[PDB]
Design a protein around this ligand. Structure first.
Ligand SMILES: [Mg+2]
Lengths: 301, 301
């Protein structure tokens, strides 16, 4: 029993964190095999922030301009290349701690653990979700760029995010491990704002199913709803539209509890209307949207 | 920016998790140097748990009856003894992944990271506080007994908790690493309940400081109070009394934000008496009490 926002054990990722220095800028790097991945903005100076020409800045660099430090040991850069917004530093040693891994680009609503790092040394681990507006509500201070987001599927580490910047609203933007940003963000210091954020409807529904599984039914009602009437209501509360894919994904949770997906949608329409009336669901006075249907099945079974 | 429930990186502790089997019972053990630590109830069958005699059950067990699995390697138990509610299995091999460590007993209100495991395999990590009633609000399913709690100071792991049981209200009970229970609990399958819990006042105040550091200032006011006046409010709303040691501990946060502890107490007094009135603090409609002053300073500075 109990429902916690649980992160993946960070160990397999800790053994990959290194410190990358270029000039006066120091950030984090991901050392997998003989390659260290990091935000390409590490090659920018006070002058190269509004309109950096990365290709021009990079052609002027030699391997010895990059200082990579894995723990106390200095790694030797033997090659460098750029792929989208990530810099790939070829090193003279393959990381002996390289776990089984893959790079995966996630979609909004997906959750992942973040190992926040400073100077290539891990600080903390926390659970995150990719918001519908392609930002993440993380916890990052200056020097955390290059910190990564991941999931662990049995023994395989799925790297899904690398930290690049904090937007003016205090939210975070980054790329997948191939350097492609999530959202319409760019690695430039120009004015860019996150779009309006919405609630991940499929995740709230899954967490309401997690509440039923752990013995709570106070919020259920005797009504049902069509998929279209649910969306007409939910979108008035800034909820993401619920698709037939979402309805299908909740199928196993619906079968476990005996409550149809659209009966649970009717209970969510009522919760939005009445609030909680001094009650909590799974120890929360708000409707939680950072637990996916997959996380619910994996945590509470 | 950003404030997240953050756990210490669990890598140093993952290298210590082993599976321990005794008959049908399989649970988790902590392998430090040449000793595996685990709950002493591993020797009990379901009938033995009704009223166990551990000294009697242990003398009738021999080294070969304990199956210790470290990954895919069998560890040979060469000795077995008991310290309070913890069973110590001396093994033939020292753990080469043993970090710099200490066994420490924490106080209620202090926080720690839990590495939840199943058959010596870590599955997740989460941060939690030792409740004033000595229980922990964790997330555990069958097979998690022997999962440990810890803090990391520099490169030293301070082990403080080992999971033993779940209480009928969903909360969890366990011991320090020397087998002494936190709370009035016994490792016997009998009617045991968690006492009435209270809110950790110094932790709520620390979290209000983190809210102010992150730009959430709506709850601040021109008023101040006294420790004596505030404690009458605390007692009424089931909050732990605020001592002078708590005000002293909050000193750096008072200085960094310009809001005295009794100035922040007048804000907490108003949130307790009048509520949040549709507003949230750090995306929460409840006053969060599982961040210590130190956790806030560590994450914000
Ligand atoms: Mg005040």
């Amino acid at each position: 029993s109990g429902f916690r926002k649980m992160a993946f054990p960070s160990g397999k990722v800790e053994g990959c964190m290194v410190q990358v220095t270029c000039g006066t800028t120091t950030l984090n790097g991901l050392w997998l095999d003989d390659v260290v991945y990091c935000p390409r903005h590490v090659i920018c100076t006070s002058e190269d922030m509004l309109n950096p020409n990365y290709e021009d800045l990079l052609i002027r660099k030699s391997n010895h301009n990059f200082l990579v430090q894995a723990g106390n040991v200095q790694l030797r850069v033997i090659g460098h290349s750029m792929q989208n917004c990530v810099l790939k530093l070829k090193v003279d040693t393959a990381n002996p701690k390289t776990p089984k891994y893959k790079f995966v680009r996630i979609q909004p609503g997906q959750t992942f653990s973040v190992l926040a790092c400073y100077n290539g040394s891990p600080s903390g681990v926390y659970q995150c979700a990719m918001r519908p507006n392609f930002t993440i509500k993380g916890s990052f201070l200056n020097g955390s760029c290059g910190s990564v987001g991941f999931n662990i599927d049995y023994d395989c580490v799925s790297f899904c995010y690398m930290h690049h910047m904090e937007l003016p609203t205090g939210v975070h933007a980054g790329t997948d491990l191939e350097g492609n940003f999530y959202g319409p963000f760019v690695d430039r210091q120009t004015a860019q704002a996150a779009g309006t954020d919405t609630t991940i409807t499929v995740n709230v529904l899954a967490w309401l199913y997690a509440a039923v599984i752990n013995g709570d039914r106070w919020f259920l009602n005797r009504f049902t709803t069509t998929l279209n009437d649910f969306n007409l209501v939910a979108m008035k509360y800034n909820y993401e539209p619920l698709t037939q894919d979402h309805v299908d994904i909740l199928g196993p949770l619906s079968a476990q509890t005996g409550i149809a997906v659209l009966d649970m949608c009717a209970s969510l329409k009522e919760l939005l209307q009445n609030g909680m009336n001094g009650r909590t669901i799974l120890g929360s006075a708000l409707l939680e949207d950072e637990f996916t249907p997959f996380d619910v099945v994996r945590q509470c079974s």
